[PDB]
Design a binder for this molecule. Structure first.
Ligand SMILES: [Zn+2]
Length: 308
């Protein structure tokens, strides 16, 4: 059975939301949030982006996180067996222009399947996403959501995620055989991947400022965190309930040229939020009218409260 959701949904202003779904990035290594060893957020710091310092993920592996964050279900009631429409289907059926560009080696895990304009790239440098993004910026409609799904910090071959121009933190760990590396070198490599992702964000913002015929927003969040040898744990996917915050505590970053959203975002940044919030935030952004919309979960809505 393929269940439909928000069957009562419907929708003016010229709007553009760029949703960036990250990969393996963990909040603890964001300088936007007070990480001091390496300045990982050098680029988006210059755009005064809003950083959510208390943002959690739905799961500890892509297979749970990616579908769940886009699903109507929150972490406590999500099941992997559910097979139904997600936030993107609701925006599409409600007439919003939806594009999904995927550079992630794992795919969209079924989220993008029913979109008309979706693309899979080769999972090389994330910068390749800027190509179909620029091309979609020519054929915009009145309301658009563009999803960019990053390879981001995918491990264990971290050193392959960024070009030499962003090997800024050294020495590095240029192997998948992570336990052989000094831990500082491993961290440096991991931080470089964050830096590269940070740069790409500000390049997205940079293209967004050339589009002022529209109200433009960037929302970036990771699917989950990552362990880097602390307590002998590597990679991710540890069962959520026993997982270290390294795997569940993720970055979330918002930017808009509409600085009223920018200041609603700034007001919420310290609240206990999570991927649970993505569903209503995405409906709310394109003003989708429906009963499944929960105003107290929309990040860009004054009635937003923290998670229970
Ligand atoms: Zn993942």
């Amino acid at each position: 059975m393929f269940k439909t959701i928000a069957n009562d949904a419907y929708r003016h202003t010229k709007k553009l939301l760029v949703l960036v779904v990250g990969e393996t990035a963990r909040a603890a290594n964001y300088s936007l949030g007070g990480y001091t060893k390496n300045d990982t957020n050098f680029y988006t710091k210059k755009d005064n982006v809003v950083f959510f310092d208390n943002f959690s993920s739905c799961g500890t592996a892509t297979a749970v996180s990616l579908p769940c964050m886009f699903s109507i279900s929150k972490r406590e009631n999500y099941s992997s067996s559910e097979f139904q429409e997600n936030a993107m289907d609701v925006l599409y059926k409600t007439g919003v222009d939806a594009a999904w560009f995927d550079n992630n080696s794992g795919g969209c895990k079924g989220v993008c399947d029913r979109l008309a304009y979706k693309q899979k790239l080769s999972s090389d440098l994330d910068e390749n996403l800027l190509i179909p993004f620029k091309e979609k910026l020519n054929h915009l409609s009145d309301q658009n959501i563009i999803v960019l799904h990053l390879q981001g910090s995918h491990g264990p071959t971290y050193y392959k995620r960024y070009p030499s121009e962003f090997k800024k933190f050294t020495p590095t760990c240029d192997t998948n055989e992570l336990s052989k590396c000094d831990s500082e070198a491993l961290i440096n490599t991991y931080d470089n991947t964050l830096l590269y992702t940070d740069y790409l964000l500000s390049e997205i913002i940079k293209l967004l400022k050339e589009q002022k015929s529209y109200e433009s927003s960037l929302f970036y969040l990771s699917d989950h965190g990552e362990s880097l040898g602390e307590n002998g744990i590597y990679l991710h996917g540890m069962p959520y309930a026993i997982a270290p915050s390294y795997q569940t505590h993720i970055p979330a970053i918002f930017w808009s040229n509409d600085e009223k959203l920018m200041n609603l975002a700034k007001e919420h940044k310290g609240l206990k939020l999570s991927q649970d919030n993505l569903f209503s935030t995405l409906l709310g952004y394109f003003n989708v009218k429906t009963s499944v919309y929960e105003p107290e979960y929309d990040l860009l809505n004054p009635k937003l409260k923290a998670n229970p």
